[PDB]
Symmetry: C3
Subunit: 219 residues, 3 copies
Amino acid sequence: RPEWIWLALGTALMGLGTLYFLVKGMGVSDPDAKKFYAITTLVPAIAFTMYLSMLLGYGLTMVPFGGEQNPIYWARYADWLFTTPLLLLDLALLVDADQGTILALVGADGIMIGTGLVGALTKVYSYRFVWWAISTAAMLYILYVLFFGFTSKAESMRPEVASTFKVLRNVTVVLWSAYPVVWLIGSEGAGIVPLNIETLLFMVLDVSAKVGFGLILLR
Amino acid sequence: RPEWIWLALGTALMGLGTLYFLVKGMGVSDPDAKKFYAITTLVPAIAFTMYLSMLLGYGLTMVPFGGEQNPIYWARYADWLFTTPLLLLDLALLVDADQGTILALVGADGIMIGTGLVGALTKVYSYRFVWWAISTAAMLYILYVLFFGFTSKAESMRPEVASTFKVLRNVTVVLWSAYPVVWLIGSEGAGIVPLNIETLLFMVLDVSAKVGFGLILLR
Amino acid sequence: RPEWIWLALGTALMGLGTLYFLVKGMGVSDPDAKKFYAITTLVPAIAFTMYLSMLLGYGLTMVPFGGEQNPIYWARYADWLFTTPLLLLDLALLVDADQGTILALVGADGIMIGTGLVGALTKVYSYRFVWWAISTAAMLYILYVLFFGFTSKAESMRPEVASTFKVLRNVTVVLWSAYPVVWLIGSEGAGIVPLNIETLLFMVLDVSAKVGFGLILLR
Ligand SMILES: *C/C=C(C)/C=C/C=C(C)/C=C/C1=C(C)CCCC1(C)C
Ligand SMILES: *C/C=C(C)/C=C/C=C(C)/C=C/C1=C(C)CCCC1(C)C
Ligand SMILES: *C/C=C(C)/C=C/C=C(C)/C=C/C1=C(C)CCCC1(C)C
């Protein structure tokens, strides 16, 4: 009930970029710029639908025993699994990396949100902190590859595509370090900050994580 | 009950192309012709399994309140999400387009059938006309890109791959304009033409949409 | 109950390769070797999570009528659909095949485990031997393409990438011929060898199928 404003405002903050970024897109100047744009207009568009999902009844599938109390949203992972892989596909093409590190990067995140989604889904004889750990170890892996493999290739004769990528790394690193700590303290972990606050918190991270990320890759 | 003949005949009309098109395929003459064939044999093959799904009990997940009355098929979107993206992958390679417009084209349809599937699934505090609209806006987008972006590239020194693509555009445009209007009048919208007729209608569009489409890309 | 040891040991036998193979990976010597490694570390990693899924309560969705007796695991197909396509992506890049035969190969397996998963899921007016057949016909197809299309390209001026691929074909062919016969005799077919034995059987095939497969592609 008290998450509605964060739900609808979340859709409103995404129902802006999909509108703004769609106008600049489709402008055939460079074939490479086309793929870069495409994605950073599809990303806030998939989450927009998803937030409108949480707004209009959707998102439910329980955590440790549902029906009795604990309310949860599955619609969230339904988009993080369909947002994180493409957002890295925009930062892997910038770094002009080989299909090798890109592949692991999809299978890495796939498992990261797969394992998290499962973690949230009921608690069938398993501890939900088990999966939270597997998904965290899955995330650190990316941070390793991000500030190690990408950096050892970040330059490309162009100071921009190398320093305007550093600002991306700052955005992303602080951004993603966030999600995990937001889990085991209320939403789907402990039970300190219930559902209400968790819903705003998660959305702040999201609007900044996509439109803000895209609001970098436009400059 | 009265959809069985349209179900089984639908499987019969697909259980023909998968058989015909499989014989001509695997003929290594051109590496490019190989990828073109592959898909237009996998498409009527995925729907064939799906139709046999609707025939043999599958397809259920409710619309506005199930269990009481309104019978629906989820197996349908389970294939449209797995047919439309590849069928455009055959018309995007013909146009020899960049990975840019191809990508948006997958994420565009993904959301088109994702949003439609959801629209059909129950009606949890949300209007099923909301998603029908989001999926329609998702479809017009493709029609824009199809008869704008593809045309402004349709030629390629080969009159065939440019005019035998125009006949594809006619097939596709009239074809897809169909689905949407078929929704809000009975099947999962209003309630004029119930389930019976809707089942034939949908299949006519399908046999023509795939085998007929493939029966173009063979000539 | 009696499958626990096979479940946990299965996770233990995969919770070894993901550890071993991760140490050798990320070693940038060749851009081509990078993609080859990536996958054969992600494969036993996805199944590892899945086995830990079967271990910790997950895997349930019934076969012919559930809730009354027949216990099943859906977590299995949840990984075979996410293991078989990538494992062939490692043997299709070795053979340096065109995007044509690779594509059919993904859509072929997709339907193979899709059709099998469905086969296992309840038995809604349909015979579970119907899908078992569709999934078998889907598998023979690959064996045709594997020991026909790949062989008629296996050489590449390098005796290794052509003979150390033959040993892969032996591993794979005997390996995959296995799964199908393991189905209609107990697990989800007849009812001779119940759940207990089926759980070991399936795991023997798995540890050998991935780590052992990977333990080839490392040499
Ligand atoms: C737009 C949304 C994006 C980019 C979401 C990204 C999400 C993450 C970095 C999530 C990470 C998680 C964990 C490390 C463990 C617990 C589960 C998650 C999903 C919160
Ligand atoms: C073989 C099946 C194919 C190519 C199916 C294509 C489907 C569409 C063009 C569907 C469009 C829809 C809408 C615009 C809104 C309502 C939901 C759909 C799925 C009927
Ligand atoms: C690591 C797991 C792998 C590589 C699994 C491969 C699985 C198969 C070859 C499965 C085949 C099946 C059939 C032919 C019919 C019945 C259903 C299956 C899934 C057992």
